[PDB]
Amino acid sequence: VAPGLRLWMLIALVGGVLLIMIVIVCCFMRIRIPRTKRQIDLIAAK
Amino acid sequence: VAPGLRLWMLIALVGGVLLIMIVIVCCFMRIRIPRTKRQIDLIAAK
Amino acid sequence: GMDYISSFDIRLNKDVYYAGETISGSVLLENTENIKIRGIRVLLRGKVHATLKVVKSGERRTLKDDQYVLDEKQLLWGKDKSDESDSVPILARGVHQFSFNFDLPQSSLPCSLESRHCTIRYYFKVIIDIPYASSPQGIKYFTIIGPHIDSMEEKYLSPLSAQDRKVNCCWCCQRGALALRIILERTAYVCGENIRVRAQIENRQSTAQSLVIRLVQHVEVFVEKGLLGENKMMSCVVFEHKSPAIAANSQGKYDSTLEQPIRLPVVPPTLVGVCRLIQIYYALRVCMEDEKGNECLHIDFPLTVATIPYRIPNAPPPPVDYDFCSNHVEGGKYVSPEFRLGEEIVLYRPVYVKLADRRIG
Amino acid sequence: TRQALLERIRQKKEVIGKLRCQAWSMTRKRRTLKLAQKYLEQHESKVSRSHLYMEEMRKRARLMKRSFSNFKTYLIPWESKIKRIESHFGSVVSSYFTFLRWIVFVNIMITLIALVFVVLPETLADSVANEGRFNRTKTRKQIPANERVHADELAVVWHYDGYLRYSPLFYGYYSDDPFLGNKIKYALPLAYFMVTLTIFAYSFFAILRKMAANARMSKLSGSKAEQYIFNWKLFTGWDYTIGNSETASNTVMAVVIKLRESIADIKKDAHGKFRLLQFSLRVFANIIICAMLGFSIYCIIFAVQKSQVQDDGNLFTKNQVPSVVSTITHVFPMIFDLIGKMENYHPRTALRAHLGRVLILYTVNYITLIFALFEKMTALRDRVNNDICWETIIGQEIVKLVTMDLIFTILSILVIDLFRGLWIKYCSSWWCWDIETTFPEYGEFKVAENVLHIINNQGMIWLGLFFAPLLPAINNIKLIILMYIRGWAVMTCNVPAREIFRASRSSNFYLGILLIWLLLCTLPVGFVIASMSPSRSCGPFARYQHFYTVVTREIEKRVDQTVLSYIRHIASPGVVIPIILFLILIIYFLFSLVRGLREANT
Amino acid sequence: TRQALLERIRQKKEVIGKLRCQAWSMTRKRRTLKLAQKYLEQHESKVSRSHLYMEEMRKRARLMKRSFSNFKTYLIPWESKIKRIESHFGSVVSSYFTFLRWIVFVNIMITLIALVFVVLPETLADSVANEGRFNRTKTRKQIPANERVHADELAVVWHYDGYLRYSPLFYGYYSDDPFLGNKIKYALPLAYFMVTLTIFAYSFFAILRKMAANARMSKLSGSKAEQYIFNWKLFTGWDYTIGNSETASNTVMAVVIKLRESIADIKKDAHGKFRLLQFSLRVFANIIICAMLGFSIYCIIFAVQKSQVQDDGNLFTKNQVPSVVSTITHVFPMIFDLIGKMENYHPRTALRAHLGRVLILYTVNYITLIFALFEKMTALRDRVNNDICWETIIGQEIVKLVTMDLIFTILSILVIDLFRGLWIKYCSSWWCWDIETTFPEYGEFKVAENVLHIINNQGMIWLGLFFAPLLPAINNIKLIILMYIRGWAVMTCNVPAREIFRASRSSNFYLGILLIWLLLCTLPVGFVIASMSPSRSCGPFARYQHFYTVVTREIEKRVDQTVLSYIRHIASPGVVIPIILFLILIIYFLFSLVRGLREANT
Amino acid sequence: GVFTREQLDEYQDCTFFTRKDIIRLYKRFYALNPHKVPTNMQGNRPAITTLTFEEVEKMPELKENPFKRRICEVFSEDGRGNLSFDDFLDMFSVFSEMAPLQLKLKYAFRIYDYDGDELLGHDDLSKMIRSLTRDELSDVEVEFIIERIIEEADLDGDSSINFAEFEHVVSRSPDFIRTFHIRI
Amino acid sequence: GVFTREQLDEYQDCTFFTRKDIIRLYKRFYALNPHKVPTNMQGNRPAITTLTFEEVEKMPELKENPFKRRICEVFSEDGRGNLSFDDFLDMFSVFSEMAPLQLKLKYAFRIYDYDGDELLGHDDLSKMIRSLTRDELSDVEVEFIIERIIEEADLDGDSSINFAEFEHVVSRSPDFIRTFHIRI
Ligand SMILES: [Ca+2]
Ligand SMILES: [Ca+2]
Ligand SMILES: [Ca+2]
Ligand SMILES: [Ca+2]
Ligand SMILES: [Ca+2]
Ligand SMILES: [Ca+2]
Ligand SMILES: [Ca+2]
């Protein structure tokens, strides 16, 4: 509807469902961005 | 002279002189009114 | 060299001893000519040897590990390796006897067993080191009785009671009920001893049930060599007993001491946490089997195999018979290839204790 | 006789109660319990009926306490999460999460107290409100039609204006009626005042109770300690909580380094060095820190001054001091740590310097914000002198500050930990230099700064819970989000510190900061209640010239005039200053007392 | 070798300082001194000129300190007197005399402070007063010719009227002029206020310093003591200062009795007894003590109320409040001891109970007298309203109370000590029963009661030194007369006690009571300064609506109005009441904290 | 009903664990070895059901503990190499946070010795050093540390630390309760 | 003055006295016996000026003290039965109220022994009790007091009290510095 009264509502709803989806995925996974010190040492040595 | 203006003053000077005399002589002397326990024991024995 | 040694023997006054006792023995060596010998020594070694076969990435890998539990040595004849004297003692031709005495430690020692994946052997190794020739070795095996299990332990004197009931329909309909109650006086038992059981059963089903009791020997072999390590899961039913069938919509009472003796088979003693390299435990499984083979209401008991019965003073004199192990239990079904020379005869085999059956006359 | 039996009973009770403190086996413990039970059974037929009544009452009380403990253990959340963070990262990081869980409990209790007695009665009365009550409360509970068209504009709802400005979230939503309704007789302004007082009282109660529990019953044996360096760094040098291989390896390396450095220092015992460059760097950094603090002061003052509009003329500038303050609170600490590179010394005193600078920054920002808000609001009142509502405006300011703080914290977590970690992982192989072994690193969980964040947020809540009854209720959700995001960030993007020290090595240090901030926050509320004049068109205190009147109007109606006049003379400054002096003197007496006892236990 | 020289100089300094404190043989100390002086002479020519100048300054400072100590030792009076009283009666009786000498020093310092800055410049200005100043202050300095003829009437002078009312001794003699005179510009009212503040400041400083020196620097190891009964009753069981055969024998028998009773108590270890009669007697004694205290309150109130006359209508009844109150303070304690006969128990606790009851009586009499006096003056000022001078009248009441206290104390000493001792000596031979072996005896020195009397008199001095600047000048003479009379009486009429105890066995017990009384006396002077309004016809504060104004008008002349307005709001009740709550909370927390610390120590 | 009402009452009275904690510990015990522990353990089954120290060492709590073997031995029953459910309960209830400082000090001392002579000798402390550091220190450094420890923590000059001396020295450490703690 | 500047400066350094106190002590010392003590006393004279113990015990300050002989013997020089001016001044300088608590404690411990082995044995304390009590207690009473003193004031179980134990025990007494004091 209005670009200043309803576009923000749609953007917020899309952001909310995207945030819920992102939270859900993370909740069932155990991503570990840092690497173990052993492989870091082997990479640094080579 | 006066009964309410000078008689009290005369009594005051008389008492002050008497008290000075009492303080003077007494200070030099070494009177010891209490009696020692030895005298108490001697009296009790007799 | 076989051409130089004429006779080699190891002799003991007794073949089985108890934990903590003093063991005595002798080595007999007979030679015909003078042989230069630096020395002859005797060693005591109790070794656990485990071999586990695994498959990784399509390649078969054999993991071999050893554990030395007993290590005692004593010089019998000759000079030590640190003796720099060149005067080597000479052993005169003929027969010579060397006696030796050792004391077993009071600590718990794992019992001997012979299996494909794990073998525990207590042995004496006599080595006659000889210059410019191969040193002969003589190995003699014996059986160590353990662990030290005493039946007077408070954990074993308490009685055990269990009960269960199952309804095949809606609780409202008491129809189809199956109820069992079992009481045992204790949990520790001696090999060859009768187990006293009492039980009450109520069966309201349309088909008869039989009480199946199975003794399951769980023997787990664990090796440590490896990033993750390899373990062996091994389970067998030692013996199975079936109770008489119970009529439908009826009740019955059961007692081993009154109906028939539930014969416990000659089995190795319970060995839990005495040796790190193998775990052995006994599970008594009780279930009800229908006419169609369906099992339900499984009850598991941990079984303890003790050696000393519950003994009050005025106890009978000790001697009880020694007999050979049964072939239907673990420890007898497999024999190492090094033990068979060529009616099969085995050089060494475990000997267990038993009381002779009721001789009437 | 009777004395012997009483002594035996006391000994048995002492053995039973102290049994949990004896290092005995389970079999021996069970045998002792059975023997005590048999002795109690034997002595049962020895006493009279009254003793049996006391015994059964004690047994029932113990059973009720045990049942309450069992039920309470069912309502304690976030146990597995805390256990996992502990066994992966240690027992010094997890203290933050335990403290946050206790803070959430305190905020839940505060919300319950502020909700059963203020918000719920008012909303219940509004639901069944009559025509007259609606006519009286329309000016405060209904948005005007002129501004209703602009109720949602991505700026009105973001500033808590419009639909939120007339919500139970703010203080002015409530009625002025002394009586909420007939046959119930609920005093609304009195309940409001008493709830505001009781919340502060309960905060003090909880903080002091936890302090006493951690001090007397937990660490009363730590007093009078000296030297014992190797005993402390070797006997209590292993963390039993660690259950990860890399964490254990880092701990082993840290303890080896600690022992080696301690022995190296104790061997040479020589510390002689004087570089003019080092002193110049130290003085330069200490000057620049004060310059940056003054810059923060000027920035917050400029932000509060530029928001000089009361009408809804523009909103792209009124939203500044929400965004300036928070930015500083989240950017200045990190730069502080960078200054620690110039000041190279012992990591323990480096952490102490960092903590001191951060605490000074937070306190200065808080005091300046309060002064600026009060000056601006008094200027607005003077200019306006229907009349504007000031409590609701202050509630707007505080809630906006809290929300922007939460948003900036989320942004900082997503940038410093997540995005930085992904960038390092996927871009350190081909970068210009060895940035994995350089300054950037991976990122370590700073316990001190985050606990200071929590304390500052709770201080803002305490300051602003009078003008907005439903601020603790929002703070519950804020703290839940904070705990979950902190747990995810620490488990997913952070590595254990190679060596970790503590600013105080004491349990009641952060609670000391919390109590200090509670007092610094109860000062302004006290001043506002005592001196400031309520608005005439909003809130339940619009019928009085002072906030406190609603209490004394109750006191003066039930107490005689002569006694009240006699009591009022206590408040004279010349009778009060001696009281303050006496309190300081007795505190000084106890401080010598404390000192003496400490010397004794040495 | 700067480090070696510093270490050597430190070792030499330690050796020099610790020589007097080391338990070495005298020759060993001399040998150490020669070694130290030789090493110092050798080390002299090792350093530069600045170090030599610093050493010269240090040794010159030590020389000044030694010379000052030597000079101070020449101005310490009453040495042989305390020495003889100590050698005759012990080291517990002489504690009262040392305390009284310290009190005399404190009072002399107070008199000097109040005399250099107030009385002397005022009298100097009056001696050179001009015609205008004389015309202005005739109504307050020069006695009217109407009453000048009746200046002495045997009752006017005794009431401090007549020539005494118009002397500097009282408050109203000092002129209202802002400046005493030209070229000096001495602000008399400001000097008055500043001296009144400095008196209390110095009293607090002296009490705190003496307590610190007695506790911190003397018995710092006396804290945390337990058991050690027989060591303390055997190793410290002899008084070394006793030098009389009778006193030595008495203390020998006393220590034998202490050991025997301690062994008897520690052997039997059984305390079981319950008599209804003794409980009834104890409760009756406690009830009659309270009733007798209430009788004291009623008598004081009636005495102040009946003195409703201000003019010289009659003087045989106006002098009934100083006389009656005094006699209570001197007659009520003794009967207390008689009541202690009914409540028989351990002397220690009986003496502690007597001290508590006497302290309660003194505090209640102080409070009631001050309340009645202030109320009577307020009522009389309202009835009369040139205006009457209430401050001068209150000063007259305080001075009359002090003088009547001195007279009654002298009479009590002459009757209880002299007359009773003479009567026993000259009348025990043919008396009806052996009074010498009965309740009378000869008279034992009571240290606690007399120290309490000294403390109470000093309390009256503190309370009344604002309305009478030269009250300490009178109190110096009163204390000197009291000390001489007490010494003569203890030599000539008293006998050593068979067993004398201590209420607390601490050197800072009487000083603690003194500090509490100082606070209790700074309460009403502070209230008078803060609340009451000065008279317009007397004193140098007649030109202000309040006492403290003379300070504020001096602050406001040099301080801007904006900063003054900012600093005013801090004293708001809503900032002070939270401070009181904070101090109460920290007091309770430190009390519990102190408790925990003591538990840990044990 | 795995545990009876009276059994749970005694478990709560002896230890610092509520019913939920006891049930969770039973679940962990079962998950260690499902075959060896029966589903029903009512009675004296906890006293007789044991696991070897190697199996218990595999759990994540004690996996990285340098003194896992010492802890298992100290908290074990009279048997060697066996750890039972009751001893498991005692081990995790002593380590718990709610246990007072005295019990933690007592069991830490009983863990820290090896011979069992109620004294901390040079051999025991050297072995602790070599186990905790993982043989990463030189012998001279280890000896220097041991010498410092004995000289700075002994008042009788016996070169040994007793239980009372231990409780006197290490109870003032603020990190002991934080470190000597296991969450389970 | 009668003393040289060096002499009185040294006396002020070692002792706790000012010029007036030293002059007064000189006057008292002369008053003990006018014949032997010279009026002029500059130089080495105080080191050689000694009098018998009986002359010192005649002054009223220590006349009634039961332990006068022990005090003089403890404060005396190597010579037996002779007390010098320096020893007299040290004796009355430690006893003064200005001397710190440590010095009084040390000299009290030195005085209270009899054999002189720096150890307070049973015989020493028994003799001290018999001197203080003046033989007004039974033998069993003395034995009980001795046993209580030994059992309550011992930490190493040596049946004796050393200087450290004495300081730890009697320095906490609030009546010590008040009693261990003689004004002069
Ligand atoms: Ca982070
Ligand atoms: Ca935050
Ligand atoms: Ca008085
Ligand atoms: Ca007297
Ligand atoms: Ca040991
Ligand atoms: Ca001795
Ligand atoms: Ca000793």
Residue numbers in the entry:
A (entry chain D), B (entry chain F): 18 to 63
C (entry chain J): 27 to 368, 382 to 400
D (entry chain A), E (entry chain B): 75 to 459, 664 to 880
F (entry chain C), G (entry chain E): 18 to 201
What do the authors say?
Here we report the single-particle cryo-electron microscopy structure of the native transmembrane channel-like protein 1 (TMC-1) mechanosensory transduction complex isolated from Caenorhabditis elegans. The two-fold symmetric complex is composed of two copies each of the pore-forming TMC-1 subunit, the calcium-binding protein CALM-1 and the transmembrane inner ear protein TMIE. CALM-1 makes extensive contacts with the cytoplasmic face of the TMC-1 subunits, whereas the single-pass TMIE subunits reside on the periphery of the complex, poised like the handles of an accordion. Single-particle reconstructions and molecular dynamics simulations show how the mechanosensory transduction complex deforms the membrane bilayer and suggest crucial roles for lipid–protein interactions in the mechanism by which mechanical force is transduced to ion channel gating.
A subset of complexes additionally includes a single arrestin-like protein, arrestin domain protein (ARRD-6), bound to a CALM-1 subunit. A third class includes the auxiliary subunit ARRD-6 and was resolved at 3.5 Å resolution. Upon classification of the single-particle cryo-EM data, we observed a non-two-fold symmetric 3D class defined by an elongated density feature protruding from the CALM-1 auxiliary subunit and we hypothesized that it corresponded to ARRD-6. We fit the predicted structure of ARRD-6 into the corresponding density feature and although the local resolution of the ARRD-6 region is lower than that of central region of the complex, the fit yielded overall correlation coefficients of 0.69 (mask) and 0.65 (volume). Moreover, density features for the ARRD-6 β-sheets are clearly observed at the binding interface with CALM-1, as well as for the crossed elongated loops of the N and C domains at the central crest, further supporting the assignment of the density feature to ARRD-6. We observed a ‘C-edge loop’ structure, positioned at the distal edge of the β-strands in the C domain, a feature which functions as a membrane anchor and is necessary for activation of arrestin39. The C-edge loop of ARRD-6 includes W197 and multiple cysteine residues, the latter of which may be palmitoylated and thus poised for membrane anchoring. Additional contacts between CALM-1 and ARRD-6 involve a loop of CALM-1 (P51–K67) with the β-strands in the C domain of ARRD-6. Structural alignment shows that the TMC-1 conformation within the ARRD-6 complex is most similar to the E conformation. At this juncture, we do not know why we observed only a single ARRD-6 subunit bound to the complex, as there is sufficient space for two.
